[PDB]
Structure formats: structure tokens, C-alpha cells
Amino acid sequence: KAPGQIYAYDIHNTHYPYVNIKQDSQTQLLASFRRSIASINPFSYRQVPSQDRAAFGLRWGNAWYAPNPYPNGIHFDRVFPTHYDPLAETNRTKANLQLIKYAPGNYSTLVVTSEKLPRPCIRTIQNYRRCQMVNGTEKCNSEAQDILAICPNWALDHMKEKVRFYTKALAINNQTYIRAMQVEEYNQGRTVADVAPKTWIHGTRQHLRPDTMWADDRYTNITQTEINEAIKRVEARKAREHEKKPVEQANVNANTGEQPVRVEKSLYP
Amino acid sequence: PVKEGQAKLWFSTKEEADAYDDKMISNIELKSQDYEDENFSPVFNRKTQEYFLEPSEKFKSDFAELLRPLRSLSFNQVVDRYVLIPPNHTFYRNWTYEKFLGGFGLSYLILRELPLRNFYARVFVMYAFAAKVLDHLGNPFPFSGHGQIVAAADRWNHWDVRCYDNVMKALKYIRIPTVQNNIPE
Amino acid sequence: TIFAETWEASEYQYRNKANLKTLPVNHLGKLAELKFDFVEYKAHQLIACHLYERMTIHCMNQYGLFKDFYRPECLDAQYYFKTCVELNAAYGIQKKFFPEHFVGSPYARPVPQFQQLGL
Amino acid sequence: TLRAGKNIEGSGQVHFGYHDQKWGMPAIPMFQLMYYELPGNSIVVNPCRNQNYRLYFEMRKKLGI
Amino acid sequence: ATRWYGRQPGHLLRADTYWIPNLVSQRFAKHQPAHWDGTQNMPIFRLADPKHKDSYMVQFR
Amino acid sequence: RMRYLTEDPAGDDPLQKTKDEHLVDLGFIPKVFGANVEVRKRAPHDKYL
């Protein structure tokens, strides 16, 4: 009847790994001393949990450690506008009552959840499907009316909206299907037979050279003489390609009192 | 002259390739470290080899050291070992917190008996001891707030309240208020 | 998916719900907290969540995963990277199936057709 | 209430608008005899929960314990 | 509709002796004629909006 | 012009508006229109600001 141990216990083989995040000499020396006497030290605290004993988290000196919250620009002012920028400081300064309040969930992520419908409403749905596959849809009127009556209205609204969402997602997935299965002009008339016997590694740096000059030793033996000659050849080709240039279009956002178009920004200011 | 290697280009014809080499070579800016050179640059000397970020041996050796107890085991042994731990809810798991935090009170018994002669010198000692506690307790006044202890995450967190649904929503979910500012129906 | 290095913040804020999180750009200041020497190109620091990924590698190469990687500059990078890809995965999904929730979408507050005005 | 999805402007329960208020039990015997505060320790799990132990007594006999 | 009409900013006088920078700068300002352009909304003064560049020192509460 | 083009989100309560479930039972089946995504809001002449 031995207590159960978690996977982390087999990595360290002890319950007393004195992990302190503060990288000061006083702290790491004391931890090494405390890490060695943890077997016979009464002032020992566990950091690896077990079935029989809970544990503490990572230590920060005498206090406890927690990562800096992910940057969040949302804040709430009290006295004056602070213009809080989470990217201007490494560690987030504490929130003073008269200065700022930060957003909730210092350590939180975005997820999607769903409420659990009432148990009696679920049993009426089970009875409808069961009577459906057995007796057919046309003979499930009594089971359908029990749903509309026993299930509270807030649940019927959820059921009504689930159908509209999945109908929306169904279209969003089929539009991606259409864009994905579209045959571009550079693949017209090409099939699996015209495919090359290559794998992912054949498009990597070892087999496919990147578009940079110093990725390998290709251009390491080039001299200034060869460069001046190459500049002359590229300029020769430009004697035939520069003949064409796109025409300047009108500025759709010329009027400042008009909602501008979110047009692609220029590469450079 | 152009050098060949294992890394090849992506052009079908040789003219497109030569056009690519001429385009790249026309953009080369040589920077030599030796005087008497038409292309001389003491500072701002460009390197001629590109750096590539790869996982080192210290990187791949520690990730393999994490899986040492799994290579010696079969899948059924792993489940019976780390997953199917026999249920035993008789242990006093929170003894770890009682011992640690209860030591403050036991430590105060021994610390309040210091043979320091000056009364104001023990004022300093107790001020330092209170600082050690207040790093965890936070607020010194009673009926004001709660202490702050970071604990390890394990499968037995909140094990005896997993049956309750409202406890999960309060701990886990931070709901986003809508324009129709109301609690969900 | 974002097919650029820069994105408009307002495009990832909600229009009919309270805004409690933003989608900030990479925190370039965390890159100066690495004490060791490393090579980082400026062409990779703007793309979302990749800077925190490369930093984690640099820290996992200089140090390991035991008793030396456990320093504040290296753990915050690992936490940021893990958190950045989770938030971006959810925002990307929410943009794919719930584009009407965000500012800039023409479906957050649809403009009616002229046939609906009765003129 | 905030965490459940309801943002709160202002604070307190002294509703300025069209709502019912409850000021607090006047500390005089008249109201202290009619009213008493809700004791949380009186809200309990239904004892029907204990009837699920019948399953255990039947299993112990089936396994020969 | 009511909120929208309320954001249409009102007219706030530029004259200000309460902010010491204007108390000094306006002593050197030259009052030029504002020729009527045919409207009833000529913003020849500052605007009663917190975000206006000449009214940000004012506390709208 | 900016405050003329400064709107608030969500408009007014849709529940205070005529329902489509009621028009059906009254004898008129409404036709569903799409969103007009090609119009750009602009401010009027200065005289109307």
C-alpha cells in the first residue's frame, strides 16, 4: 500500500528539489546546502507532489515565483491617464490603487465552453432519437412535444442557435474547400503523374538552396571584377523589361471626411 | 567564379539560373579587412556565412533525459504506473502546508526567548521575522485579506469537489460581459 | 492565420463585448534580458510568437532543462511562447467562424440594403 | 457577478435607479425578533446521498466479502 | 440617437486665465476677424471635448 | 467630421423591434436581405456639422 508517485518524481528521484528562481549567490548556495540535508532536515518543504502529500511551487527567495503575466494593454485609470504600455517594461509594475487597475486573469487563456443542458431535457432528447431510429420520425410527435414543454425556453434557444452556428461553420468549411480544391493557372492539366518523387527534406536547406547569398559557399569566390560584369548583364536585361510600368491609380481615400479603405500599407513610409 | 554544392537552385533552364546568379552577384558588397584594397572596411565588415538556429546537443540530450523512465516500460506498464494509481483518499495531503506555515508559530516560541538584552534590538529581529511571514500572508491586519501561496499542480487538486459544477465555473471561467449586461440566463 | 508581420489591433478587438485582452506585438525588450551571447536577426522578431520560440531555443542551448534553465529570463520566454500560440490559435479560430464579433467586420453591425428603407 | 459575465458600473447596493434596496437589519429588538440572518451552515447536502451506499452493501455481498 | 447627438461637440471659448500657459500666450495673441462662411457651426473657438487639442487640460467629469 | 463618424457599438435593443416570428403569424413572410459591405460612411458638408 505504498503512496503513488507522479512522473516528475522519477526524473528527480526526490521530493525535495530546492528550486529557487532568484539567481543571487546567497540563494543558490543556501539551496545547495538545503538540497543536500532535505532527508534529515525538519525545515524541509516538498516541491514534487504525491498521492499522500501535496507540494509547493517554485520559490523566489523567501517568496514564491510566478511568471510575468502575458502582456495585456487593457487597463483602467483612476486619477489620470497613464498610457500603460506592457511592452515598455520587462516586469509588470504593481497596481497602485490611485494609478491603474489591470485586466482580470493575470494567467488566463481564451477558450470556448458550453453549458450542460438540464438532465430532464436530455432524457426527452434521448427518447426522441430512440423512438426515431426505431419507429421513424413521423411517429415521434409525442416525444417532440415533451421536449418543447419540459425543456426550459433558455435551452430551446441554445438548441435553436446551435443549428445556426453549425450551419455557419458548415459554409465556412465548404468555402475553404472550394478555394483549396481550385486549380490555378500554373497547375492546369497537371495530375499525380506529373508530380516529382520528392519529400519534405528535398525542399530544405541541404537540398534546396535558400534565396540568400551567404547560405552556403556558392558566392564566396566572387571578385569585384565579376561583379562589375554582372551589373552590366542585369542592366542589359532591363533594357527590355523597363519598357513597361503600371499606371498610377486614383487615391480612393483622397477625401478625409470619408471612411477610408483598409488598403495594403506601403512597405516603407 | 560560381561554386557548386549540395544545395541546388529551383530553375528548370540554365538561363534563368544565370539570371539569378547575376542578380545576386550584382548586389554583393565586398568588405575587406586589409588596407590597400578597393573594398576596405575596418568596421562594418560583413560576414559571408549565414547563421542557422538549430537545437544543440544539450538541447536534444535533456529532452531525451525526460523520457528515460518511459523507454524501459511498455504502454500497459506506463498506464498502470502513472495513470492507474490505486485510489486512496485517506492521506493528509495538506500536512505539507500545515508543517511549513505552522513553523512560523513554533519558530516564534523559540525566537521570542532570545537573550538579547536591549528591547529595541529584539524589535529589529521581530521586524525581520514579520517580513519573512508577510511575504506569504501579505496583509498584516485581520479580517482584511488572504495569504498567497503558490502550490504544485497535481491530479488531486480540488479532488473532493470535482462533483460540483459551480465550483469549476467560479475557478476556471472568466466570462466576458456583453452589451446586454446580464448573467447568462 | 495572419499572413504578415503586422496586424491592426482593432481588428482583433470585440465590438459588442467587453475588451479584456489585446493581441500585442512581440515583446522585444525581453530579448535584452538574456545574459549570454546570441545571434538574432531582425527579420524574425515581428512575426507572431516566433521570437519567444527562438529565445526558448537559445536558452535551452546555453542552459539545459534542469537547475539552469530555471531563471526568470528563460521561463518567461517559454511561458510567453506557450501562451502566445494558444491565444493566437483561439483568436484565429474566432476570426474564422466568428468574424462578426470583431471590429472592422461588416457583419458586426450590418448596413442595410436600400430596399429595406422603404423609399 | 462580475466573473459570471455582468459588468458593474458604480458599487454598493444603494440602487440609484428603479430597483429594490435592502438596508440591513435595524439593530433594534423589533426587527431582531422577526428576522435573522441566513446561516450558511444550515444549507446542506440532501441526505438522500447516503442512500447510494446501498450499492456498496450489495456489491460486497456479490463479491463474497 | 441620443448618444450620437451628444458627441457633436459644443463650442468652448478660447479665453482662459485658469491655465497659466494661456494666461501668458494669449497676451501676445492677435485677434483676427472671422469672416462668416455661411454656417452656424464655425469653430472659431475651441471645442468642448476632452480629446480636443486645446481642451485636454479641462477635466470633464 | 470625426464625431459625426463616431458611433457606439451594438445600436439599440433588437427585442424592442418588430419580430419576424410575429409577422409570419400576421400574414407577411419577411424577405431576408444581405449586408451592404460596399458603402463607406462619410461626413456631410460643413454646414450640417
Binding site: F80, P81, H83, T256, G257, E258, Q259, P260 | P177, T178, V179, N181 | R15, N16, K17, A18, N19, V103 | N7, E9 | R7, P50, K51, H52, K53, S55, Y56, M57 | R1, M2, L5, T6, E7, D8, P9, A10, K41
Partner: peptide
């Protein structure tokens, strides 16, 4: 939802000044 929330359709530039917030 935040009381001081506004949706603007034209670009604006905010001042990055201490103690003040304006266009």
C-alpha cells in the same frame, strides 16, 4: 461593456504625453 467606448471611422493620432490623453 466599457462606458467610455467609441468606434471611430476616420484615422486619429493620440498624444503620447504624461497626465494627458487627447487627439
Amino acid at each position: 461593456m466599457q462606458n467610455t467606448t467609441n468606434i471611430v471611422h476616420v484615422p486619429v493620432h493620440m498624444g503620447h504625453t504624461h497626465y494627458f490623453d487627447y487627439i
